[PDB]
């Protein structure tokens, strides 16, 4: 099947929890300013754009704003805009209606409650396009894919640390809430240690089914660069992925990378059964 249309190829009734999701980490480093151009090699994480990467397979992706609606990296503006984006994966479910996207919003100056308010009318905007819940509902269970049929799911994370809140409906989940597992261990890590991390968290993410697994496959370290770091494990981690499709392990969760290689997509998608 085409990578622009994997997902509609699966069961309706199977879980999101269930599935082995390629993603990008830092989504829209791929262009920016003056700054991002001085400094490309440190703030760099992709090659394709937004719309490309959704062509590409990536389900999942993390987009980091701040309250002037506009898309960042730190102090560093992405040549982007949040309606931007909104449109982009809008017009892409429009044209994709069976695809369902996984979407962590970040407050990238977390400090105020004013990003909150700031994004409602753009989402609110685009209301038909995000699964969205009661208000007065606290099971934060995760979804089959009959619920989030041409829908994003949205991952929210600001100061308030709570979920987007629009009327009498909740829009989407918190980001870190209790049904994740998030392994983000960025820092400087070294090759072999991290490529355990990732290892481990794929194993414990095939054995559960009622949890997000966010498995970041991405670092960075003032001595190795996220490029550096991706070209040692992205392939380690796609012969990881392919060993465990003949032992038929499936459901590794959401592979999240950065510079991903449209093979490692495809393979990632492969694990899932069809």
Known sequence: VTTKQWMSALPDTTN??????????DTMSYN????????????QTQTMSLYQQLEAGIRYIDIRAK?????????????????????????????????????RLKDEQNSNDSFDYR???????????????????TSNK?????????????????????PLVINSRKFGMQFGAPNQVIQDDYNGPSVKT???????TAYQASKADNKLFLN?????????????????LNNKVEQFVLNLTSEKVR????????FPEKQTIKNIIKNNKF
Do not use: C
């Open 32 to 43: 920016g300013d003056i700054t991002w151009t001085l400094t490309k090699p440190l703030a």
């Open 119 to 137: 994004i409602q009318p753009l989402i609110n905007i685009y209301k038909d396009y995000f699964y969205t819940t009661p208000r007065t509902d």
């Open 142 to 162: 995760i979804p089959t894919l009959k619920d989030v049929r041409g829908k994003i799911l949205l991952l929210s994370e600001n100061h308030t640390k709570k």
């Open 16 to 25: 999101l929890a269930a599935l082995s999701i390629p993603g990008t980490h």
């Open 251 to 258: 459901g590794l969760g959401i592979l999240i990378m950065d």
């Open 194 to 200: 991290k490529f355990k991390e990732i290892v481990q």
């Open 216 to 232: 970041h496959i991405s670092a960075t370290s003032l001595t190795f660069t996220p490029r550096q770091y991706a070209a040692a």
């Open 67 to 103: 309250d002037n609606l506009n898309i960042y990296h730190g102090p560093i503006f992405l040549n982007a805009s949040l309606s931007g984006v909104l449109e982009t994966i809008t017009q892409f479910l429009k044209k994709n209606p069976k695809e369902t996207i996984i979407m």
